[PDB]
Subunit: 319 residues, 4 copies
């Protein structure tokens, strides 16, 4: 290849910029031009495309967000969009595309290669529910954003306000809740991939009050329900005053952790390697601490699971 | 005075430990003994009182919360409560008290001196709504906790999710909302001390969208209402996807900023100085960047205000 | 005034971007156009000038550094360079200039104003070493950068390595060292504005050890000496294992604190108001918690001081 | 087992507290009592032993340092101290020991099993220089401390001062240098595990400057040499203004990251599991993203390595 392109699709995730940098620099190191595609798939369709110089990715490795911007475009999930997309790619002489984003981005990448255009997926999202990788770029940053909240709550807790609910992200995936909950010392974690009984939650609460536990912190993934709702139920059932934090999109934001920039730098460069060596239709990832790649269609067919042993352990340690 | 006591009352505030450290160290510096009263006025009534050595306040200056704990004690707002407390103090040879806490905690200080126990109040709250001081210990830290979330929101924003409502604390005081809003570059800031109009607010959003503003941020003081409600009304009226963050008690936790440690160190020491000077029934503060102290009753009789010029400035800059 | 300019000069200070944002927005809000001057005075001379649209300062309020850049321009110290500069301004239809930076930066404003060109100076540096203001934009952020380091060192302290030296910036002023050392609970703070006795330092250190103080931390303003030197003298005199941290340029970097953004916003805005009100040759500032402005040459005549009572206070608390 | 003990030995590492909490809770969850050994192997000999109640490891999971304190004990390096300690253990009825700490603390765990006393090693150190584990507790936290500095330097860089040297920790391991380097976008990284050429280094810097690179960041592991010298040699040879930050012990301090709290929680628990299964004489770790344990002797046999491809990658991306 002589010229590839790169874009970001889906929700923002910390480390997208570090991934864009790696894609751009790796390619330039091998004498390949990199063209930036702005505003996700919609921008591709619209021909919002502009060459990225070696210096255009300077001083972004440590920046949250994405200098290429993002969008949600379901039109690229159609033949028409696929067709317009490829016209713009060809018209700008782009021979391969690196797509950095979530679930929806991989579907687009799969279609693209089914249409004969070489494309590689890079997992850039916070909730860690992309197949073919143990970790997604942004997940680690998000966990740290969450435990910053938990830690402050531990300071703020008093004798009559010792009961706290924190609603985190993860509509279908409980990874954020599980990891941040274990990292935060959460007494109870409500995820989708495991079931909960309110009587147990409430009992854990009372058990801990009795034994002298200074405070109880409850993590609730948005996919399970609303923090405000569980807070009300919990106060109503126990008469403990219960305060609620709803983090929201704060989790999608901020400067990426060390681990996120390293992962993004490694995976972005791999994606370039794969384009240059004639592979396409793949997604990159990290599994068992080793760099991997997979046929996209094959990877999308794998259900996402959490570490149940990790879930059980978080219950054991809050005694 | 051979011996004094120190306690914390009201909601937790970042920097209470710095102020505790200061009280202990200043007094010990002048040869005075210092006793910790744990769990605030409730703990005082209960006689929960232990001597604090010079090293009992090592490694707390940078810690959030309060090593002495707080409580709500309505009982202390009764003659029989003010009696058992006076008794427990005399039992312990405690001749003077430093009370670190919110506006509420000052009542106990007032009465205590009227019954012949010198007491000085030190303003410890994030609300910044204590009289006789431009700033309360904790306010600056709370502000940095808020803009942390606002900054992350800036990274998380996309073309489809570009409207955000963040609800902050401050029961009746818009200080947190106004300062965080200005420093965060909020488009709109809703505070109880200023009339607002939801139609003008919505006009502002639309105007920003028309001129290409990437995202719009709305700060809401809890005194004005729920972030959830304002968000829902904004999305319903405009069709703009609107996300909501409710920080809650996060704002009361965390390690105190430099400003808060410094302010706490100076107010704390000033309080010891006042007792030793034979003063009593006073509250300390900082006004016009100068350390001050006022009679408690005269101070608590002035209504709190915010800087209206700063409010208008925030609207000007956020075009 | 139809058109004004803004530039940054001196070392980088956190909050310069917030001030740039405020200058641009406040002027645009009154229908004045703003032109950016890149690379400071050197840039002004070279005609490195470009218009800033309303959205060009979007998403900078929270960013460290300066999007305009800085540049030590000795050429502007000469009456020749001032001529080429005023030439480029006139050439670009620029009627007034806001200058954001440290000392030297103000000398430029004066001389431009001696030459009848209206210029307002805005205090942007971490040193707190600028007349006509109690605080400079960047100082607060720098303090928090320092105590972050001091805090981490508290965790890393052992019985063996109980003694630490940290060298902080300040140039000729002790503000950073004084405020950070107090904020961080330093046993000893060495600043230019106050006499010190290395023997008393040695004894203070031995005393601390005798009484079980888990660690001693010594803060050294760079304008007093080298952290590595002092660290030697101390290990040699006491046989205590002494470790030295030198922070260096880290103190000029990072995202501005809330107080810095607020100061930056208010002062940048005031600067613009002064230009439109037909003033010139003024510098803005905050004194006694009030917005002020002064004649440059006059303010420049004041010698800088620190609060000696705070310094005293610092010794009293770290026994 | 009906009762076990736990201690920390070696340098302080963020997450030692999370590990301690884990050991304690996991044990108590299976009906086992846990006793704290204070001040490392010296305290085991001196008999500094006290029981740890379930609430005694509350509010420590997010704290840096170690509540058990640490120490250097050469006396335990002997068969006299080893018997003295085995004696102190039995005197309290402790059937098993968990040792959380660095490479040397494992040597101690080896002997104790030799002498018939079941012991497990938990990798607590920032330098990542401990066999039988891809990552040590504290490593991730250290990396983030380092890039916090690198990031701020990025802001502080100007056209005149645009070359920076940061010396980081790692006496014989370049993991910190390597990972923080890659994550922070360092141009050159100097580690023991890789031969380097000051010439290629100077040449890199010069090419960077020619192509318009804004600033150059050089990371130097302490094992390789001194940051101050490297900055002097580099300035001399280039006349490029070169600033040096030496972080020192701040790398060992701070609240643990999410990954470190998770890793500490998982490795601590497994250590307890092993003791209770009767499998003393082992160390736990994470390898290829799975929990492992090894005989200590067999583990200590392996040399420590880094990933040469990551070192190479880091070169490719900083062109």
């Amino acid at each position: 290849m002589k010229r590839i392109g790169v874009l970001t699709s889906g929700g923002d995730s910390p480390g997208m910029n570090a991934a864009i940098r790696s894609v751009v620099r790796k390619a330039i190191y091998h004498g390949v031009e990199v063209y930036g595609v702005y505003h996700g798939y919609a921008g591709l369709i619209a021909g919002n495309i502009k060459k990225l110089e070696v210096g255009d990715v300077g001083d972004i490795i440590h920046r949250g967000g994405t200098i290429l911007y993002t969008a949600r475009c379901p039109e690229f999930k159609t033949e028409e969009g696929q067709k317009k997309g490829i016209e713009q790619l060809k018209k700008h002489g782009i021979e391969g595309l690196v797509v950095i984003g979530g679930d929806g981005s991989y579907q687009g990448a799969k279609k693209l290669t089914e249409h004969g255009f070489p494309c590689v997926g890079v997992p850039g999202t916070i909730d860690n529910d992309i197949p073919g990788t143990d970790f997604t770029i942004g997940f680690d940053t998000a966990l740290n954003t969450v435990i910053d909240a938990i830690d402050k709550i531990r300071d703020a807790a008093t004798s009559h306000e010792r009961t706290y609910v924190i609603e985190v992200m993860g509509r279908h995936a409980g990874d954020i809740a599980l990891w941040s909950g274990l990292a935060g010392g959460a007494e109870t974690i409500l995820i989708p991939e495991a079931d909960y009984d309110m009587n147990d939650v409430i009992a854990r609460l009372k058990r801990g009050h009795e034994r002298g536990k200074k405070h109880s912190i409850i993590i609730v993934a948005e996919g399970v329900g609303s923090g405000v709702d569980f807070g009300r139920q919990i106060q109503e059932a126990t008469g403990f005053e219960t305060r609620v934090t709803v983090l929201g999109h704060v989790q999608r934001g901020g400067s990426p952790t060390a681990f996120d920039r390293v992962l993004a730098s490694r995976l972005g460069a791999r994606a370039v390697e794969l384009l240059l060596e004639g592979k396409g239709g793949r997604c990159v990832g990290i599994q068992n601490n080793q760099l991997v790649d997979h046929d996209i269609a094959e990877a999308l067919a794998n259900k996402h699971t959490i570490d149940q042993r990790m879930y059980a352990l978080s219950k054991e340690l809050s005694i």
